[PDB]
Symmetry: D2
Subunit: 488 residues, 4 copies
């Protein structure tokens, strides 16, 4: 077993003063991975004052000095990629085949990206007249808070802290109570790279206490939240009631995958598989509404079933395992409730629909890869994000119809189209009300590419140059060199 996990405040581990702890479970076995201390209201106050002190040191350094420190953190993350991925697999249940290739690789890609952009962060200068001009400064916000989710723990920590730190802020990061372990490791790595004490503090805890204490704190200038749509609305409200914080939200979706009448169905089946069953379906951007032309539906169903049969659940550290248990046993219960609603509302179950059983599965939170067909737009499984391995296949007749049905949702995160035709690909994508659109692919999220939701799926964006800027605030300065005229 691991040692009791403490808070990370001001460059060292420190005991919480809340007197409270929680446990994180290994979802493959049900065993306790670690007991974790929970940050109380006073621990949060201590973290903010640590962050205020560190942020001043960090911002006073030169831009290239900050760049070099983050680059050293990148180097450590590349060296420790396999070790960090193994820890992430234990905490999340995701196969090592995923965590060692994606989670830290792409988290570090984003930190590496923003490290190089720090010196390009510039204000503007605006001439008004010969005797007066304006210039702007992109100043740090100060202390910002990141609230992470459990499906990509260290990647989310990196995607939130990289731009925040790169812009000259300190960040207090609260990982999900489900998956707190890699965030604490990241804090140690940042310190090892030379990040000033206090610039990245980590506070494990539960949302109702530690999360709320951060969102309410008067000296936190911005909150960045990743999680479910409902919890997001609550976070965003509480941030306004306290001190009118800036907000960023990356929430869930019900993203449509549109298969065009001229699509190759093997390619379409491969994209739908990767859009539904990666990380056991626990991805906010998953293409869980798969729209297929009626004339191709039966053949598409056959190709999905063939690929589903190739899914390899088992030992999460085995090279050939590509499917894991869900992150927790309560989450499995929620996915199973959705599956039962699909059955009772008349969707046709093509495969899966139950837990996995037998040696090596009975103690883990496993759900079989599940595919429903003959789905309709009013069904619960079609309208609501499930966050488990459940694909809904929907038939359609014409392009105008599928665009309307694709857009007829409160969600807005991602979308995609499969077509070899130039006009159809751009024409359709331009009409879809989603922030992340994939043509003949799914899932790739380059550090350069801003990502976030339309409508109820988000506020603001992550990644790209714009996100570095969104972690600064503009100060406009007018220099008046002419004589000032008063009307009094």
């Amino acid at each position: 077993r691991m040692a009791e996990q403490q808070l990370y405040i001001h460059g060292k581990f420190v005991a919480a003063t809340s007197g409270k702890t929680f446990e994180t479970i290994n979802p493959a076995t049900g065993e306790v991975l670690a007991t974790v201390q929970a940050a109380g209201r006073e621990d949060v106050d201590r973290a903010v004052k640590s962050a205020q002190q560190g942020q001043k040191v960090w911002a006073a350094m030169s831009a290239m000095a900050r760049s070099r420190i983050l680059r050293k953190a990148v180097d450590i993350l590349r060296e420790r990629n396999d070790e960090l991925a193994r820890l992430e697999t234990l905490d999340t249940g995701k196969p090592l085949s995923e965590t060692a290739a994606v989670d830290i690789v792409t988290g570090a890609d984003v930190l590496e990206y923003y490290a190089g952009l720090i010196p390009a962060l510039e204000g503007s200068q605006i001439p008004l007249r010969d005797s007066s001009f304006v210039y702007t400064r992109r100043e740090p916000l100060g202390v910002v808070a990141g609230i992470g989710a459990w499906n990509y723990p260290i990647q989310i920590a990196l995607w939130k802290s990289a731009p925040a730190l790169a812009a000259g802020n300190a960040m207090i990061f609260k990982p999900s109570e489900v998956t707190p372990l890699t965030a604490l490791k990241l804090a140690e790595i940042y310190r090892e790279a030379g990040l000033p004490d206090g610039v990245f503090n980590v506070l494990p805890g539960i949302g109702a206490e530690t999360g709320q204490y951060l969102t309410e704190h008067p000296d936190i200038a911005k909150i960045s939240f990743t999680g479910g749509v409902a919890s997001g609305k609550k976070v965003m409200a509480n941030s306004a009631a306290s001190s009118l914080k800036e907000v960023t939200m990356e929430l869930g979706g019900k993203s449509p995958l549109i298969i065009a009448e001229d699509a190759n169905l093997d390619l379409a089946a491969d994209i739908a598989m990767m859009a539904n069953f990666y990380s056991s379906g626990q991805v906010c951007t998953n293409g869980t509404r798969v729209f297929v032309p009626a004339k191709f539906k039966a053949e598409f169903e056959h190709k999905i079933l063939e690929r589903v049969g190739r899914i390899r659940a088992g030992d999460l550290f085995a090279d050939d395992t590509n499917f894991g248990p869900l992150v927790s046993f309560p989450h499995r219960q929620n996915v199973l409730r959705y599956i039962e609603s699909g059955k009772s509302e008349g969707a046709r179950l093509l495969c899966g629909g139950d837990v996995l059983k037998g040696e090596g599965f009975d103690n883990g939170a496993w759900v079989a890869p599940t595919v429903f067909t003959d789905c309709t737009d009013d069904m619960t499984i079609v309208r609501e994000e499930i966050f488990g391995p459940v694909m809904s296949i929907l038939s359609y007749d014409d392009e105008a119809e599928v665009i309307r049905r694709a857009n007829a949702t409160e969600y807005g995160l991602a979308a995609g189209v499969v077509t070899p035709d130039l006009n159809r690909a751009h024409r359709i994508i331009h009409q879809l009300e989603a922030g992340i659109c994939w043509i003949n692919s799914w899932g790739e999220s380059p550090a350069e590419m801003p990502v976030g939701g339309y409508k109820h799926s988000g506020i603001g964006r992550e990644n790209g140059v714009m996100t570095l800027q969104s972690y600064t605030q503009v100060k406009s300065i007018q220099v008046e060199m002419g004589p000032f005229q008063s009307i009094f």
Copy 2:
């Protein structure tokens, strides 16, 4: 005047609320007009009208949109005086202000954004020979603006100009105190060729019409200007309902720092313009004036001399430069703060009472008021008054004044008066405010982003960035290589 209706889809329409309210002329106490209030059903009609207009509007070319907004600018320039007189009647601000500032600078911002529409561009990012990303800056759709009463038509233009320029339709709710010019603007936009529904105006009260807007599920963004308390309610309800993007321009308690090397005639002029324009009803006003102790007595003399030249009177008279407050309930709140200053030991330098006599007894007048000997714990020093109440505070050294200038939950504006190169930039760089003026006050060019730090605001208005903030980024990856599935 005739009973004022809602403006929905290019025409005046009766409200379905069965409710009305009155707007009072603050100079006479008389009712200017009865105004229909938009109910929950009216808001839904406005949204559906806005959805229809926005699609027509967004389908036009960028230059087609530019030309239509430019035509609205031409109409606003022509009707500057007519609109200003209506603004004066509704707000109590002197015609000397409304005819020179309110429509002029409102139109300036609309004109600025009209020209930037064709420059609104996405990006393209190569990943590898076989895949690239490009982005679109798409309209949000239907957005809502909630205006304040101190600059009714200017606020309406500063919100609607970037929103319309970005391809959105806007539903605008003016303050119930000052609803009249927003309705005039709606007619002007239509006359310019704005498609029906792209700018709808829904007068009403904040507790009903404003709340219905913040709650509507099909509104993508709310832009609010007003007080801090009302703002927190707006931003909460916008999140609880449909997770709207939000922009907030709130009040402040902005510091004016007079340096030890400042010319005191210049410093006094800046302090005057920072406190008594629009009778002190300006969000950015420099209501905490920090003066070095060694010059405090002389500065107080120079302020008193200039206060003596203030000309209250007929708001349509050329030489009038001071008006009544926007309403009698607001005057009562301002008087509550003034009495707080007296009881907490601040020294009254001038004013502090209502104005009396022929032509003033019927208006909501408060005399220009100056407190000195102020300390950082006083209520008048800590809280926004939004009336003509200057607070003068003494200081000894530069480090102190910076700490005290920043020791506030507000973050809107700030300024320094000094002829020294290093001092001006050095001090300004350390102040926690979004709008900083050196050797001046109040100028807000269309090019210059403005908004608050800390409790004074969220987001910005004006400048290129605000046009972008009325769009949403769509990222599109083109994968020309063979897609690899691990299953």
Copy 3:
């Protein structure tokens, strides 16, 4: 006959002091349109001193004051579009069906575009440390010169003067001696719009004198030239040798049009026609090397023959005329020599190849629309810009081959591909060495879109936000607020 045309200097017409004149001819009839004064060395020096004085007034105005004046000029151009187009047709020989729909419309579009961008022209601000920061100004160059070509006289005058003026400069414009008339009209329009005197001066003359005097003048900060590749090299040399001027050059090309194996051949033929025979083939961006798959070549040739048979030469003011004479008898002589070279080098003449004869044609320099096929990469007509209505059709077998052959040229101006396939369209275009690339279209040049040549086809760009910036020069300013340390 028109009245004698004078120089335009400092807001009024003025006699040249050179004592020299030239005539501009109506290319449809041979009649003298007007006698035109030629600017001498002293006239250029007067124009520069006028421009220097006007530029200071212009640059001192507010940004929106400049914007409003250029917009008034736009409004005048819209109102007089048909009158100016008729003058352009008389001077150039291009059909009114073209000049009234393109030349002034698109010239004014660019002026309107830049008029609106003036307030967005901004510098930068760069923090170095707490005690020092840098800011930049985008200052006007001062006095710049534009040298126009004869195929699009007023359009070029607008595309050069609009960004130059919007950036705060004065421009001295030298129109082609072939086509000086609309530039003089534009100068009056600017003044009527409120442009300060001296900000746009126009100096007709011949290239060997007036053009050379401008390129040599020591107080002209930049030369922008449109013309042939050969003449361009001469101008760029003289500008460097005299005073080290900044330079922009829009030269000719031999642009490839690649027809993919999956293209609809009616669409491909329509694009090829528009890419070769608009303005009687006198267009720098024309797609004069048409690459067609071997298996479709015969059918494509038939479709070209059918469309060529529809070309309607005749009265240039008639609605149905869509083909005009070449601008002059010397230019037709050169085109005729290229046609004869094609015949003698073994290319197969598909149609045309001769002068037009008979009533209405004997007085103009008309050449029949000409198409050569069976062309090979070594032929003179394939390698060299003809600037007449001469299409070369080349067969190809595979995609790698056609990209190689398309790129095997010193020219670099434009290119295009015809294909409905998403991957093919972007994949091919990304490999073509040209600045202006069209997918399933040809010729459109939006004000927003920077256009210019690779390799020998140009230096710099016109249109787009970047061209406004390129008519400014960057000044960097460091404010050092810390104590300066000397090592001596």
Copy 4:
């Protein structure tokens, strides 16, 4: 002495086929440092073909892969700083106190800066209408050539190669024949960092042969030149006559230092010293015209004499040496000619004016720190760049006068003002016709700050984000999804 120095082509040293060599002299002793092979016409052609091959590999890599390789070159340069600085001191005669603190540090600072910006290099996307859009690519130019100067050999090589490589190009670099050695070392360092073979080739040689072969080559797309005004005009002409290359030129200046009437004269004297005597006056940006108010002139002259007496010439490797010989004996002869010109025209010699003599100086190309006063705007030493340690002090009476005199020159490189007054500093700087402006300082050139000349002092800029973009060329691509309409 060193072994015969070879060319660097395609990742290795290779013997030249020209049969020609030249020698580089140690300016402190007159000894031959090394015999160096000169690249011939055939050698330039091999280098270009090597560069074309390397550039294709380099450009095909990911952006972050290119960033990492340039960052490894940075790390090696930091490590080998002292070794490289000693070599630079031997080759240039600049004191080790300079070369070890400035030359490699600031060269590497720029490489490090551009390494981080590679992922931020983005094109644009422009919607035209629902059925058509434009997007742009910032493509590499291909093979570019940089031609270096002798005063900052490795710094110039880094400032040219860093943006060029970061933008995806290969560069062929020709160092000055006076100082060829550190460029060859840089070529090895790049390869050691993982730069693909051919991406950075170094061709020592003379300007009239090797330099000309580069400017003439048809497959080099851009020339970047740093040197004198005269040779620049020659280079820019030959580049146009051959293949219409893009050009950047960083030439000399006669930059003014304006001392305001409210300036502290100790600060002004310190700024004037650093603006004139660093690198023994061999800096293009030097403030060689020092304008002082008449009322302060006598006191300022005394303060200059005091500080000139503190200059410590001697052993270039001694810690306390801060002044060196000139780069070569022929260059000293030209500097002496300028000094005699000052005497013959009646300028008053305040100090210096002769060679240094005695043990340790008789064998080196030493010139004493020289200050002329009572200078006027028509004097040769005032009008012409000397590129030696020669300060000219000019009296003035009022602000308008000094701005006019500061600007009355063909040069435009730098300028500066000394004043504590807010309005005066910005007011004056905004009116000066120079690209590089310093307030209350001199000489600092941050990687973020674009630098280059107005008027005859240059074309284009170096450093800053704009210089990364200027090493790409814009390709505009229109996607037309609507039906194309032909008028034929």
